């Protein structure tokens, strides 16, 4: 029942190069979820870095005990890439801008995109990838070369089998 515990966990999971982690959502409990970004990361020019979108969204859904659809938003902004994490789908923002066979996406100045956990799971199922736990996790590989930000939503997998009971 720790709102800041989730943000700390997410910051741990996200690589260090993605400067950020601020709340910007106010006090929120697993029952009461905000409409503001729970976490906010940002990268500078040349931040050829990866973001574990599936892991963070599934973790957000785990922490909350109310039905929801965690959502990530990516903005090329004007000088730096901006990742935002909302507990519920925002409005005025493109929903499913990640369609199968369209892993590559480009973002010009002030442009935006995003993805919800429902759309992520549906796309994962359509591709027929392994739905078992930790057998297929999505990763957003972002290259920020101004004025553009080039994203690739690639499903990366495990290297072993670990403990499965």
């Amino acid at each position: 029942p720790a709102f800041e515990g989730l943000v700390q966990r997410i910051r741990l999971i996200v690589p260090s190069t993605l400067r950020g982690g601020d709340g910007e959502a106010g006090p929120y409990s697993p029952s009461s979820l905000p409409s503001r970004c729970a976490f906010q990361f940002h990268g500078h020019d040349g931040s050829d870095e990866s973001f574990p979108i599936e892991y963070v969204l599934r973790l957000m859904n785990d922490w909350a005990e109310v039905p929801c659809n965690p959502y990530l938003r990516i903005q090329n902004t004007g000088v730096s890439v901006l990742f935002q994490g909302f507990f519920h789908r925002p409005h005025n923002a493109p929903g499913g801008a990640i369609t199968p066979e369209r892993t590559n996406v480009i973002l010009g100045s002030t442009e935006t995109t995003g993805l919800s956990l429902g759309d992520l799971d549906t796309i994962k199922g359509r591709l027929g990838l392994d739905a078992r736990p930790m057998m297929a996790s999505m990763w957003i590989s972002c290259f920020v070369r101004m004025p553009r930000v080039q994203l690739a939503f690639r499903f990366m997998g495990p290297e072993d089998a670990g403990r499965t009971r």
Binding site: L12, D48, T103, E159
Partner: protein
């Protein structure tokens, strides 16, 4: 999304107790399950993110993760002398290295003879757009998949647009290669296409980006004289004549 929450709650809770194992596991999720992504011609390279190579062949038009495709991993060594400054150096040094970059000059001669135009003016006009020469220089295994080059007048604004002709029935563009092509000449657009069972990469203008601010001045008359002094290979000239005749009726993408 409740089934996900159910079958993942136990795992997430068990991971919360040991953050080290969590970081290790998430960092261990670096094996792409989808290496090849389908592409559809005509395809513009602007949609190619870094770390993406293009395999256009009879087996399909597909993009590949630069890290997993075999030919990309087996590069041509450390040919990392692809800096914009070094390309400018080559552009200025064209006068003394006429023997290399032979396809460029042979294509210019063939076009000048085919359209009954002057060679000095054609050299001055093509030299006004050094981005085409930069593209030629990057794509140079110097025989190892040495791409051919055609020059055709450019519609809208523009003196001459370029057609990079890839010989054979296949063409693999390295991910670093595509990245450096897009970065060195930003104002020019690259579109892949096929014509008469020959793969082509069309280079056209997309904004005023000749970099006249940092563009070096190279004498076109001296290059013209050195070209008139060197005898070109008849095979290259005949091949360029055939390529121009075949591509003379090509709708530019």
């Amino acid at each position: 999304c409740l089934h996900e929450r159910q079958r993942y709650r136990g795992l997430f809770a068990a991971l919360a107790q040991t953050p080290s194992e969590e970081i290790a596991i998430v960092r261990s999720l670096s094996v792409p399950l989808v290496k090849t992504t389908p592409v559809s011609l005509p395809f513009c390279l602007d949609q190619t993110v870094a770390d993406n190579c293009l395999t256009l062949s009879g087996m399909g038009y597909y993009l590949g993760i630069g890290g997993c495709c075999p030919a990309c991993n087996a590069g041509d060594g450390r040919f990392a002398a692809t800096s914009r400054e070094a390309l400018i150096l080559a552009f200025v040094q064209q006068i003394n290295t006429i023997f290399e970059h032979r396809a460029f000059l042979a294509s210019l001669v063939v076009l000048a003879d085919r359209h009954n135009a002057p060679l000095q003016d054609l050299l001055a006009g093509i030299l006004g757009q050094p981005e085409l020469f930069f593209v030629h220089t990057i794509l140079r295994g110097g025989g190892a998949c040495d791409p051919r080059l055609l020059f055709y007048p450019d519609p809208t604004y523009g003196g001459h647009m370029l057609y990079v002709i890839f010989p054979g029935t296949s063409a693999h563009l390295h991910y670093l290669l595509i990245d450096r092509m897009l970065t060195a000449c930003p104002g020019y657009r690259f579109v892949a296409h096929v014509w008469q069972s020959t793969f082509v990469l069309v280079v056209r203008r997309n904004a005023e980006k000749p970099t006249d601010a940092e563009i070096p001045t190279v004498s076109a008359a001296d290059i013209y004289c050195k070209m008139r002094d060197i005898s070109f290979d008849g095979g290259l000239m005949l091949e360029y004549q055939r390529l121009y005749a075949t591509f003379d009726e090509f709708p530019p993408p």
